[PDB]
Amino acid sequence: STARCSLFGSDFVNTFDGSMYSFAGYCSYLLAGGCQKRSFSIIGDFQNGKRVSLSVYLGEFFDIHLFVNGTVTQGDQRVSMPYASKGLYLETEAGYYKLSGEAYGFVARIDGSGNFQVLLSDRYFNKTCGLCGNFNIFAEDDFMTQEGTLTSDPYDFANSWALSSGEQWCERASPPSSSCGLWEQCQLLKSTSVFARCHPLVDPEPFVALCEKTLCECAGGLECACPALLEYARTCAQEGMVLYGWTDHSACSPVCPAGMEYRQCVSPCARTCQSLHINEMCQERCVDGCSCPEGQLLDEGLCVESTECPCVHSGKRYPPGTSLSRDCNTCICRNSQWICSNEECPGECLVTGQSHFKSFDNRYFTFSGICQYLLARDCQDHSFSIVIETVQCADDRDAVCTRSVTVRLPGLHNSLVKLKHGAGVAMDGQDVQLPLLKGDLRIQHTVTASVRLSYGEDLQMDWDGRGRLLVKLSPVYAGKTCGLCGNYNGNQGDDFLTPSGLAEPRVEDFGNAWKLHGDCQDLQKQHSDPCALNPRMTRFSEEACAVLTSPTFEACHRAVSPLPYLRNCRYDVCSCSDGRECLCGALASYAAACAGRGVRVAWREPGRCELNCPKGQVYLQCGTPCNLTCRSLSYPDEECNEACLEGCFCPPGLYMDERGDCVPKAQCPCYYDGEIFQPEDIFSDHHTMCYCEDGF
Amino acid sequence: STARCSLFGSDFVNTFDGSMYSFAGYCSYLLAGGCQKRSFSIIGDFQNGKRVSLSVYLGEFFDIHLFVNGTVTQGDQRVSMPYASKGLYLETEAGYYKLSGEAYGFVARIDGSGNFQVLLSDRYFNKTCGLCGNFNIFAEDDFMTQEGTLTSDPYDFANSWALSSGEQWCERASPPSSSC
Amino acid sequence: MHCTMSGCAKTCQNYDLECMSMLCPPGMVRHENRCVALERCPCFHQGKEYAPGETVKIGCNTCVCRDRKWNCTDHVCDATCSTIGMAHYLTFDGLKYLFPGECQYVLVQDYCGSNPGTFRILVGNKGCSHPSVKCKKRVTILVEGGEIELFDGEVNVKRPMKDETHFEVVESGRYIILLLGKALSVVWDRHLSISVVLKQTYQEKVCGLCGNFDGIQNNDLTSSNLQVEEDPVDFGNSWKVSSQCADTRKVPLDSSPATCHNNIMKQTMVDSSCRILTSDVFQDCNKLVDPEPYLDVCIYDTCSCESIGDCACFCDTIAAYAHVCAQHGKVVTWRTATLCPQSCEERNLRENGYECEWRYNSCAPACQVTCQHPEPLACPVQCVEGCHAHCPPGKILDELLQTCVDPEDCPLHDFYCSRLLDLVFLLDGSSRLSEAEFEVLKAFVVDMMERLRISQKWVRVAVVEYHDGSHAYIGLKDRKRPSELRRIASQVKYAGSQVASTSEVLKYTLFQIFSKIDRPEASRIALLLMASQEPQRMSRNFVRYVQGLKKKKVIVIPVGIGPHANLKQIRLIEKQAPENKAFVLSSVDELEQQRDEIVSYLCDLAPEA
Amino acid sequence: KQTMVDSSCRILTSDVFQDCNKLVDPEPYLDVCIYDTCSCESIGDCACFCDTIAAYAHVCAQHGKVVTWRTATLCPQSCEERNLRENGYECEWRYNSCAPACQVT
Numbered sequence A: 001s002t003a004r005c006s007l008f009g010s011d012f013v014n015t016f017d018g019s020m021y022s023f024a025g026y027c028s029y030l031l032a033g034g035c036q037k038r039s040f041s042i043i044g045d046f047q048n049g050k051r052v053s054l055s056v057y058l059g060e061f062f063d064i065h066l067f068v069n070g071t072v073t074q075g076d077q078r079v080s081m082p083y084a085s086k087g088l089y090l091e092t093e094a095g096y097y098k099l100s101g102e103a104y105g106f107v108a109r110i111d112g113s114g115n116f117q118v119l120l121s122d123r124y125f126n127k128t129c130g131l132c133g134n135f136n137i138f139a140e141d142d143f144m145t146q147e148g149t150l151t152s153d154p155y156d157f158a159n160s161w162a163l164s165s166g167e168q169w170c171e172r173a174s175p176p177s178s179s180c181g182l183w184e185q186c187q188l189l190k191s192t193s194v195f196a197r198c199h200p201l202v203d204p205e206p207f208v209a210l211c212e213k214t215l216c217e218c219a220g221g222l223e224c225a226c227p228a229l230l231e232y233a234r235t236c237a238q239e240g241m242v243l244y245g246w247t248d249h250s251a252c253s254p255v256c257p258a259g260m261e262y263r264q265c266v267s268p269c270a271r272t273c274q275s276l277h278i279n280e281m282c283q284e285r286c287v288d289g290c291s292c293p294e295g296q297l298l299d300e301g302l303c304v305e306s307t308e309c310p311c312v313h314s315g316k317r318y319p320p321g322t323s324l325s326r327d328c329n330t331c332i333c334r335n336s337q338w339i340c341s342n343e344e345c346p347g348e349c350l351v352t353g354q355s356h357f358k359s360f361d362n363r364y365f366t367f368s369g370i371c372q373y374l375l376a377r378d379c380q381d382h383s384f385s386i387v388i389e390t391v392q393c394a395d396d397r398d399a400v401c402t403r404s405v406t407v408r409l410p411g412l413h414n415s416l417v418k419l420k421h422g423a424g425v426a427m428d429g430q431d432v433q434l435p436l437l438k439g440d441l442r443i444q445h446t447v448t449a450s451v452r453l454s455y456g457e458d459l460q461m462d463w464d465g466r467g468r469l470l471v472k473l474s475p476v477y478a479g480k481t482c483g484l485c486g487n488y489n490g491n492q493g494d495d496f497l498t499p500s501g502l503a504e505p506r507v508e509d510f511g512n513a514w515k516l517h518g519d520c521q522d523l524q525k526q527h528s529d530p531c532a533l534n535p536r537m538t539r540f541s542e543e544a545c546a547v548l549t550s551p552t553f554e555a556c557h558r559a560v561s562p563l564p565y566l567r568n569c570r571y572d573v574c575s576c577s578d579g580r581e582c583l584c585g586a587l588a589s590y591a592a593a594c595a596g597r598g599v600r601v602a603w604r605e606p607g608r609c610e611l612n613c614p615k616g617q618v619y620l621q622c623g624t625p626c627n628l629t630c631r632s633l634s635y636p637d638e639e640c641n642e643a644c645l646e647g648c649f650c651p652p653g654l655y656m657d658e659r660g661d662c663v664p665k666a667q668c669p670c671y672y673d674g675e676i677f678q679p680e681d682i683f684s685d686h687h688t689m690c691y692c693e694d695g696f
Numbered sequence B: 001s002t003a004r005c006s007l008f009g010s011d012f013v014n015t016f017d018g019s020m021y022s023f024a025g026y027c028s029y030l031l032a033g034g035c036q037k038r039s040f041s042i043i044g045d046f047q048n049g050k051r052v053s054l055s056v057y058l059g060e061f062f063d064i065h066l067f068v069n070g071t072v073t074q075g076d077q078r079v080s081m082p083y084a085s086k087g088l089y090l091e092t093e094a095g096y097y098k099l100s101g102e103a104y105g106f107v108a109r110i111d112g113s114g115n116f117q118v119l120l121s122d123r124y125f126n127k128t129c130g131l132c133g134n135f136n137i138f139a140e141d142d143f144m145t146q147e148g149t150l151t152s153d154p155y156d157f158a159n160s161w162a163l164s165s166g167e168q169w170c171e172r173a174s175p176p177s178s179s180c
Numbered sequence C: 001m002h003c004t005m006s007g008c009a010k011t012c013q014n015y016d017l018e019c020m021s022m023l024c025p026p027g028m029v030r031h032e033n034r035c036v037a038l039e040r041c042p043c044f045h046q047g048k049e050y051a052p053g054e055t056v057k058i059g060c061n062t063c064v065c066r067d068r069k070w071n072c073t074d075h076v077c078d079a080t081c082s083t084i085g086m087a088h089y090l091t092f093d094g095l096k097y098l099f100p101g102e103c104q105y106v107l108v109q110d111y112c113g114s115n116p117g118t119f120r121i122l123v124g125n126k127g128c129s130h131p132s133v134k135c136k137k138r139v140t141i142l143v144e145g146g147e148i149e150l151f152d153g154e155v156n157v158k159r160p161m162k163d164e165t166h167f168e169v170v171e172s173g174r175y176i177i178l179l180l181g182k183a184l185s186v187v188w189d190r191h192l193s194i195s196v197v198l199k200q201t202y203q204e205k206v207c208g209l210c211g212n213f214d215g216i217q218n219n220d221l222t223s224s225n226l227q228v229e230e231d232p233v234d235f236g237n238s239w240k241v242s243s244q245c246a247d248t249r250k251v252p253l254d255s256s257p258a259t260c261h262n263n264i265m266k267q268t269m270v271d272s273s274c275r276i277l278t279s280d281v282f283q284d285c286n287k288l289v290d291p292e293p294y295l296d297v298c299i300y301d302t303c304s305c306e307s308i309g310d311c312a313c314f315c316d317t318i319a320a321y322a323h324v325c326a327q328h329g330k331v332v333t334w335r336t337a338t339l340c341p342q343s344c345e346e347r348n349l350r351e352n353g354y355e356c357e358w359r360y361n362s363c364a365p366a367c368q369v370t371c372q373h374p375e376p377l378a379c380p381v382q383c384v385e386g387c388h389a390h391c392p393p394g395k396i397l398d399e400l401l402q403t404c405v406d407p408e409d410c411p412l413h414d415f416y417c418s419r420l421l422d423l424v425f426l427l428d429g430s431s432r433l434s435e436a437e438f439e440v441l442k443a444f445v446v447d448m449m450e451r452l453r454i455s456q457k458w459v460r461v462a463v464v465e466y467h468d469g470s471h472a473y474i475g476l477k478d479r480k481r482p483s484e485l486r487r488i489a490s491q492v493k494y495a496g497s498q499v500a501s502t503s504e505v506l507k508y509t510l511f512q513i514f515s516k517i518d519r520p521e522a523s524r525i526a527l528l529l530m531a532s533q534e535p536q537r538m539s540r541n542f543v544r545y546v547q548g549l550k551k552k553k554v555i556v557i558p559v560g561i562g563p564h565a566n567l568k569q570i571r572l573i574e575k576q577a578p579e580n581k582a583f584v585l586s587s588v589d590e591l592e593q594q595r596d597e598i599v600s601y602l603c604d605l606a607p608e609a
Numbered sequence D: 001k002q003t004m005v006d007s008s009c010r011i012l013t014s015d016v017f018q019d020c021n022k023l024v025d026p027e028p029y030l031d032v033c034i035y036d037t038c039s040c041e042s043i044g045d046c047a048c049f050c051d052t053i054a055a056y057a058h059v060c061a062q063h064g065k066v067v068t069w070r071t072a073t074l075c076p077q078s079c080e081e082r083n084l085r086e087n088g089y090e091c092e093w094r095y096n097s098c099a100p101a102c103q104v105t
């Protein structure tokens, strides 16, 4: 229940009804379409007599052009293949450019030689018109003009179906001039066994006549016969008899892409390096065209061995044996697949901005209750407990942020460490000079001036003093945690667990269940998208936070999803005491997640969020921390493995002093027994005699 | 079934409930609006202590600005009076610049001297907040902050209702001195 | 610091938490401002209080309040994957995501990895995105050699399956239902929101756009190439069936699609149109279920076909939310003549004339006894929206007569070691073994697992490739049957990595496998079947991990395979304890030769029960 | 989108209306349907779309060309709310393609 037409060789056309003629086009002409009412139009585009493109127009709302050089254009814009829009699918099949519209009820193709073909479903039987004819049992009632007359002249018919446009208005074309050891090549259609199989189905006489015409027209050798033989073979295939020998019972080989070979009855659902197997549920008839050699596979239009097939990730191709990694896990490409590690990685709980959260299990949420809340605790061995104090941080009711943090360490003789606003620290209520190393606990100034805290290898924290807290746990705590950052079991789906042992589907009741004090108000509802309370802020909040999804972060968008950070940014900018600071904090938060996945973004610029350093220091997007301070000179045997990080650093030959000023190595003070000595200081004693030089 | 708010003279404000105070504004401030859910915001715009514009935001989808000089601007495009969009009507009445939204249930005006006034239907009784107060029988309880507490101080109240924008980050206002 | 305003004890909910850090007798806690015994405090859920001995139902599971905590049942409920819109999917694990696409994609399949697949379900938007019709999705179900297509509101069994005795097609309300077996079923909204339901017997066996059915949302978005993608578009593109078809274009989060894309004002009119999901009729469901995903879907599928009325895009999202609410037992009477109405009057316009039997119901019981369905079925859903025939007592519906009718109408080896052991096999997935050699290493592991009494009692086994990470294919706690565990061990894949960190696999066994000793009676042993060196810079912690394993009394047996095993690490393991006997081999070919003395050494180093 | 509103308004040119399209011109009401379907895009049902068709159906009925244009999918009107009364679900109400006006009540 289908019919086929083709435009082929020099000038030839074969109707849906097997009437053949020659026509050198100069306009673009209607090949096929709905004749009484035009659901779609299929147009043959010509220049200087030659074909140049096949163009489909859908109603008047969409049009797509496919050129003989494989270029495609939609409207007036060039578009890359493969393509799909408005119910059309434009793709390679059997190495040849294909344009399918079987929702409308047609499919079309251009082969490597530039021959067009079109197939119409029986939906258009006796209901179509154009150069491909009128699609009915008769072949001789073709040549119907748009004037509705027959004509005996193919050029009156074809010019009657010419379509002018604003691109060019086109002349009535006319037959070319003519003046006519190769003739036997056309008689293969009659003489030669593979072609002779099809004589009960397709009469050779028109095709051999057209063959003799191309032998008159064409200036080449024996190859001048080949389009008529090819189109006869394709007509036989359409009539249901494939001519498997035709291309080697004759000298005629069709054009194919590099590394492919022409063959008959190529299957649809062609296998590729990247495609899962349909196990023969394709249920579609084979076609002629190019194939890769047997056992070789196609990849992105080129043939490669089955052992050569790349893997794909992040929209890119990688050869076998390539290792990628996500967090601590590595994925190795083998065959079509990634062999991916299955170990648990360090859990990064986060509190940031206007009380946005990330669970250890990567669940993002916002809560904005005001109380002391249990953020993260070892619920099994109680080796640590982290608590946050949340307060309203602007005039808005939705602007709520962490004011201070409290860490209780029962293993450290039940010490209580408070991380204060402005990045101060107190221990058991006493304010401490920040470089502290007593017991398993260590506390330090980060180059960001953020407080960093460590408690063995298995707990680390990083507090900015401005309501941002990052908590890192080793996999030793996996499954053991509790509080607002969840149970660290690798699953988002239970992070809203509560002390009652059920997961609240409401983030409000979840967060309320972790409040430490009974007179704190239960949060009744969390008002997402607070821009309604300050409508003046929404235009800037959108325009500014959209940078997170702009091209500047594009390298990061496949390393960390930007969508939670964009929601957090728009909330922050719409509802805080200074939206510029909240913008910079949200952008820094996403850039920090990128750096956690090893993607570094040059996102700062003079228009936004420059990290302007104190005098003598210089900004680095990435500098090494371990050798910045004079203390590093004074304890040069200390362990330090921390990664390169963003901050303000001294210029490459200078170390950083207690005043924050940058000093040469010879000018650093020396630190001994926790006590500070100037350059060239001497002391001598019954136990030791020592002197300060080069900060040591 | 209506109540009236006014912002008049140099610096003065009169609430829906008849409490009056002076406020030398330096930014823009919520005068009135739906307090539990913000169907609209009516915004008073100030510069150097003076009033300069009366503005209305509808949800977040539309914003209109009416200046004390009779300029009108929608979004950032200047528009000629009279004007009508999104169920608002903006027109001259009795020689004075009128902005009406009685579909939303309010109307507002600027007179030739630049005094604002704002009128709410009873729809917003005890359901509104901003410099115009909370619109209830009581008047001593007009100084309700956005933080949700009743301050004794009119500048703490008004600054609590300041609204920043990307063009205008609000500085905190405080009472000017005088020789009196 | 100017201030405008100025101004341990334990309570039933806080007692388990920290003290405030910023009042009753011992063994007592406050409730309602009164000190009371802890065993009288209520449990909390939905933020509501329930007394001890009260019971709550959560899905199929149920929990009784015991000593301030929920003492739950441990069932696995029937997991539902759903297409919830034109371009939105919800995995079996409840992860909502966005993935538009013109091609055909695997919604779910059983043909995952090594698993012999029983079925596929395929979906695609073919024939959408143009003016002349409202969009409809195709469905294609390929269970056990059959094929059922769902399209244009019709069901078409294009190929009979190998055993039809397990197969039923059903309709209830406005929903088609298909039962494909005891454990697989489909519920089809003719307006785009296709749904699939699986019982606990499937779980991690299935994969596709539905994710993989387990507890773990984070391991959905696993591509067909088995890598998790950060972007749902790349994940969904990997599940494209037709090899040549166009990959879905990746794009930024523009504020909304389609008709909203230029039109922020009209986008807010879409947002208000979707506020039906937050109205007082839904607000009781909005406790048990989050409306936000369905509202977001409503935005996308009303910015597609901007409406406050029954376009295929809009009202679908609310019918789907109402359906989910009804499965949570919260039936929602949401339709009216003002909003998304349905008329069953065409069903009452009968051959006798107009006669009431049908009407719309907010949810009718599904899979009812019918002349077309003479007995009850294992229906996947409790009830469904739509037209229902309210038949009088004992009468049976006939669908083809559209009317109520009378019910009279219509061991493996001689060595089989049985002793208290935990055993781990650590396999060098470097390139220093070819795949052909790694098959011999796998066979060695499998055949030792034929010679040990594999169980949670006696000998526990884990199997771990490392390949420059660590890759447990089996863990000690995996309660699967011994023939299943040997099957999985034989199905261990081959990485062939450029590096294989011996130190990091020792780290993995030290900290992640033996995280705590749960079998103090058992010996524990690691076969470090190592074939590659580490690059020197990685090795620095190696001695710390092996001596930590000695502190955790794990015996490490370094089996050095081939010339590229670094003998230094072999002997450094032996230096920690005499128990750490090395084996060193010229090739994998003599693994199967030394197997006897190896496995016997394991059993000599493990105590009898 | 222009061709979406156009094709959506082709209900006025469908074979159920084509009998009316002799006596009455569909084009003015189709132009209104374009304008209104630009305000609501719904192919199956929205107030502006359904009312401009219902307005054309009303004009047709005034020309005696009564037309059963609605369906359970295309702009359905449901009277089942009026059937639920003190007798329970009682059969009296239905959608009528045209009810006679101002019946004795």
Ligand SMILES: *[C@@H]1O[C@H](CO)[C@@H](O)[C@H](O)[C@H]1NC(C)=O
Residues within 6 Å of the ligand: A052, A067, A069, A071
């Ligand atoms: C393909 O041919 C057309 C003209 O026929 C031309 O405009 C286009 O640039 C060509 N493309 C390439 C890649 O040569």
Ligand SMILES: *[C@@H]1O[C@H](CO)[C@@H](O)[C@H](O)[C@H]1NC(C)=O
Residues within 6 Å of the ligand: A126, A136, A137
């Ligand atoms: C084809 O259509 C014409 C009307 O245009 C009709 O007269 C003729 O009989 C049709 N032929 C067939 C074979 O249906």
Ligand SMILES: *[C@@H]1O[C@H](CO)[C@@H](O)[C@H](O)[C@H]1NC(C)=O
Residues within 6 Å of the ligand: A624, A627, A651, A652, A653, A654, A655
């Ligand atoms: C710190 O080390 C880096 C190399 O890692 C070096 O470039 C830099 O100069 C060093 N800093 C000082 C002060 O020597």
Ligand SMILES: *[C@@H]1O[C@H](CO)[C@@H](O)[C@H](O)[C@H]1NC(C)=O
Residues within 6 Å of the ligand: B052, B067, B068, B069, B070, B071
């Ligand atoms: C009206 O006042 C505003 C604010 O000072 C100013 O931007 C605008 O240009 C003024 N219009 C005229 C006509 O002076």
Ligand SMILES: *[C@@H]1O[C@H](CO)[C@@H](O)[C@H](O)[C@H]1NC(C)=O
Residues within 6 Å of the ligand: B126, B136, B137
């Ligand atoms: C005003 O509203 C509050 C709730 O915010 C209520 O407690 C109070 O009684 C109301 N007063 C009047 C007069 O309605």
Ligand SMILES: *[C@@H]1O[C@H](CO)[C@@H](O)[C@H](O)[C@H]1NC(C)=O
Residues within 6 Å of the ligand: C066, C070, C071, C072
């Ligand atoms: C539930 O209660 C029973 C009876 O006290 C007990 O045996 C069981 O361990 C409890 N399980 C949980 C998870 O609380």
Ligand SMILES: *[C@@H]1O[C@H](CO)[C@@H](O)[C@H](O)[C@H]1NC(C)=O
Residues within 6 Å of the ligand: C361, C362, C363, C364, C365
């Ligand atoms: C039908 O709807 C009514 C409410 O109108 C409801 O009570 C009933 O449970 C529903 N189902 C059946 C089978 O009646």
Ligand SMILES: *[C@@H]1O[C@H](CO)[C@@H](O)[C@H](O)[C@H]1NC(C)=O
Residues within 6 Å of the ligand: D095, D096, D097, D098, D099, D100
């Ligand atoms: C009511 O509807 C029927 C069709 O349902 C129609 O034939 C009849 O003319 C209408 N009017 C009356 C009064 O029945």
Ligand SMILES: [Ca+2]
Residues within 6 Å of the ligand: A017, A133, A134, A135, A136, A137, A138, A139, A140, A141, A142
């Ligand atoms: Ca013909």
Ligand SMILES: [Ca+2]
Residues within 6 Å of the ligand: A361, A486, A487, A488, A489, A490, A491, A492, A493, A494, A495
């Ligand atoms: Ca979790």
Ligand SMILES: [Ca+2]
Residues within 6 Å of the ligand: B017, B133, B134, B135, B136, B137, B138, B139, B140, B141, B142
């Ligand atoms: Ca008051």
Ligand SMILES: [Ca+2]
Residues within 6 Å of the ligand: C093, C211, C212, C213, C214, C215, C216, C217, C218, C219, C220
């Ligand atoms: Ca999963």
